[PDB]
């Protein structure tokens, strides 16, 4: 019960209303808008391929929608209801269902519990907020790649943050100053970074 994002699955970082950076960002991997503007690369720069305004961004923007719509379709498996830190836990594979506001300070530990193919999709109802030096983990098998972020609203990423999983918000991306991802930035609105590391994974 991961989420396949098709075309979307090669992006960084992907945005119907543009990509702006800051800084000497680093996506490895592709970078599209359905829009007209990137900004700030340089001093940013990809390593895959820019796809602005073409049949490639189109394609990565709807199959990163229908995801996002299947990511909130999941029935969830854990209800954390009106819980608002994600910090100091360990999670097995799990849908976990969080009602308002969620932040990351500290840390969270993601468990694959000796299978690999552990899946977690996060269903944030509305903000993700990660503090500075905020750090997400993987132990015992968990990969990057079968970690979602379904975020209702915005997410919001802490300067110097770390975070694994594939982000995939209704509007906006922000990834304050030197926060780095294992994972994916997909954006309904803009994406904004700041002297990022962005490194798409794969299974």
């Known amino acids: ?94 849908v976990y269902k969080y009602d308002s506001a969620v932040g990351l300070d500290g840390v969270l530990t993601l468990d694959g519990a000796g299978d690999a193919s552990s899946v977690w999709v996060f269903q944030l109802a509305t903000t993700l907020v990660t503090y500075a030096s905020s750090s997400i983990i993987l132990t015992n098998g968990a990969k990057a790649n079968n970690v979602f972020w379904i975020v209702g609203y915005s997410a919001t990423l802490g300067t110097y943050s770390h975070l694994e999983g594939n982000v995939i918000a209704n509007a906006l991306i922000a990834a304050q100053t030197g926060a780095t991802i294992n994972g994916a930035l997909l954006a309904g609105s803009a994406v904004t970074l700041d002297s990022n590391t962005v490194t798409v994974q794969n299974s």
């Open 1 to 94: 019960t991961g989420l396949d994002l098709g075309a979307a699955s090669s992006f960084g970082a992907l945005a119907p209303q543009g990509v702006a950076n800051a800084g000497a960002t680093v996506i490895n991997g592709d970078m599209g808008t359905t829009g007209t503007s990137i900004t700030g690369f340089p001093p940013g720069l990809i390593t895959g391929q820019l796809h602005i305004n073409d049949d490639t961004s189109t394609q990565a923007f709807a199959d990163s929608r229908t995801a996002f719509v299947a990511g909130q379709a999941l029935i969830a498996t854990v209800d954390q209801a009106g819980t608002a830190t994600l910090g100091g836990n360990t999670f097995v594979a799990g």
